Amino acid sequence: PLIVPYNLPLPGGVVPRMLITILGTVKPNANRIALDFQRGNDVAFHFNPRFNENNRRVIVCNTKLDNNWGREERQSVFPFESGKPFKIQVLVEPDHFKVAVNDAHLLQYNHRVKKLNEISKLGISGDIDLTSASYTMI
Numbered sequence: 001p002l003i004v005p006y007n008l009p010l011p012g013g014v015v016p017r018m019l020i021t022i023l024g025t026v027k028p029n030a031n032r033i034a035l036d037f038q039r040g041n042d043v044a045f046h047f048n049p050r051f052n053e054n055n056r057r058v059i060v061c062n063t064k065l066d067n068n069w070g071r072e073e074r075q076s077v078f079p080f081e082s083g084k085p086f087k088i089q090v091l092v093e094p095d096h097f098k099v100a101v102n103d104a105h106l107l108q109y110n111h112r113v114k115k116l117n118e119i120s121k122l123g124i125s126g127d128i129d130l131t132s133a134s135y136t137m138i
């Protein structure tokens with residue numbers, strides 16, 4: 001078990017066919033989780049499950065450039081549950097990130113930040129017990 005917030009180095013950034021796996025358990029009374037694929041201070045891909053935005057559960061995705069959030073993309077399919085173990089897999093493809101949770105496709109996020117080999121850190125934060133974070137080439 002790792003302490004959050006956690007930084008996973010991504011030296012050489014990301015590349016198509018790279019699969020990033022995040023394993024953890026949602027805390028009781030969770031409010032939010034965040035994955036931040038970073039290029040320096042910019043956030044190429046922010047993946048933000050919100051457990052209680054107006055008594056609604058929603059996943060918010062966005063990009064932060066020069067400290068300004070862009071236009072959100074939202075997903076109401078919500079596979080995470082307080083108290084339960086999860087696996088997030090982020091598959092890098094040429095035109096988008098493809099996200100699966102617990103082996104089920106969840107969403108895609110088109111690349112806004114185009115320099116993938118400079119997205120050199122993944123930050124993992126929020127209301128989880130983080131077991132592990134790693135990647136491979138499939």
Ligand SMILES: O=S(=O)(c1ccccc1)c1cn([C@H]2[C@@H](O)[C@@H](CO)O[C@@H](S[C@@H]3O[C@H](CO)[C@@H](O)[C@H](O)[C@H]3O)[C@@H]2O)nn1
Pocket residue numbers: 032033034046048060061062069070072125126
């Ligand atoms: O790491 S965190 O989870 C996090 C860290 C510490 C405590 C809690 C969470 C975390 C989330 N955030 C951001 C990020 O999620 C961003 C994505 O678009 O959304 C904004 S809220 C956004 O505000 C708009 C007005 O400007 C409003 O128009 C819009 O409707 C509404 O969605 C978030 O504040 N930064 N850090």
Ligand SMILES: [Mg+2]
Pocket residue numbers: 095
């Ligand atoms: Mg497409």
